[PDB]
């Protein structure tokens, strides 16, 4: 859709669960689409900087999760189309990750990149 497309290249962040790369204005107004009920992002800015982090590299133009090898490798087949990444460095604090497992959300590390 036209709501998930980044509008301006400057001031872009990325999520850590589904690695959703968009613009800060969309994050403040729309927020993470693939996971909204379990993350509570729409209607505030502090949580954006709490969970999402700008430390990420790599961009991919994802259009068909159901039929693509990159999606299977990244484990993002059950997500909506959009611009994702391949390496998001970061880790959520010990106050938000706890409730994800209780509600039936498996927290995995999307930082597929290697260290040294």
């Amino acid at each position: 859709a036209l709501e998930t497309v980044p509008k301006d290249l400057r001031h872009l962040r990325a999520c850590l669960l589904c690695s959703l790369v968009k613009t800060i204005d969309q994050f403040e107004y729309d927020g993470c689409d693939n996971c909204d009920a379990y993350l509570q992002m729409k209607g505030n800015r502090e949580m954006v900087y709490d969970c999402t982090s700008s430390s990420f590299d790599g961009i991919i133009a994802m259009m068909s999760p159901e039929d693509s090898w990159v999606s299977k490798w990244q484990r993002v087949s059950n997500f909506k189309p959009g611009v994702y990444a391949v390496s998001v460095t970061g880790r959520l604090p010990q106050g938000i990750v706890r409730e994800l497992k209780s509600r039936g959300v498996a927290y995995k590390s999307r930082d597929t990149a290697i260290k040294t």
């Binding site: 900087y49 430390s55 991919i60 133009a61 259009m63 490798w73 998001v88």
Partner: protein, 141 residues
């Protein structure tokens, strides 16, 4: 499994090409001439060409028509082996973490190692640790 193709591009324009391609796909997805491209990879370390995912060469050949940026890489479509379908996504250590060591390019402390202390969420300025090198105003006039 789908194949990954390679197309040449200009040096310094990789995110603009990606956003233009996504806009074209979104604008021409409900028409009689859709795009069969699955995905494109634009790694940050590489600069000078981009990748594209599709089964046949005709798909990407007819999907990059009209664009004025990929005109250079239009008469040749190279195919990479299946073993290279996993090294492109690899990244060697983004690169923004506090209490880390970074280097400077401009200023006076050129080619010197420093250390990060605090990061501003505004993404406009960042603190840095370094030992001063000035002469304390004794040599200069």
């Amino acid at each position: 499994d789908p194949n990954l193709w390679t197309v040449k591009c200009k040096i310094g324009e990789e995110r603009a090409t990606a956003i233009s391609l996504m806009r074209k796909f979104i604008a021409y997805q409900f028409t009689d001439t859709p795009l069969q491209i699955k995905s494109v990879v634009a790694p940050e370390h590489v600069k000078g060409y981009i990748y594209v995912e599709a089964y046949k060469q005709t798909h990407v050949k007819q999907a990059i028509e009209g664009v004025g940026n990929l005109r250079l890489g239009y008469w040749n479509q190279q195919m990479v082996p299946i073993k290279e379908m996993t090294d492109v996504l690899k990244v060697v250590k983004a690169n923004l973490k506090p209490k880390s060591w970074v280097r400077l390019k401009r200023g006076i402390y050129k080619d010197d190692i420093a250390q990060v202390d605090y990061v501003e969420p505004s993404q406009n300025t960042i603190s840095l640790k370094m030992i001063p090198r000035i002469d304390y105003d004794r040599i200069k006039a």
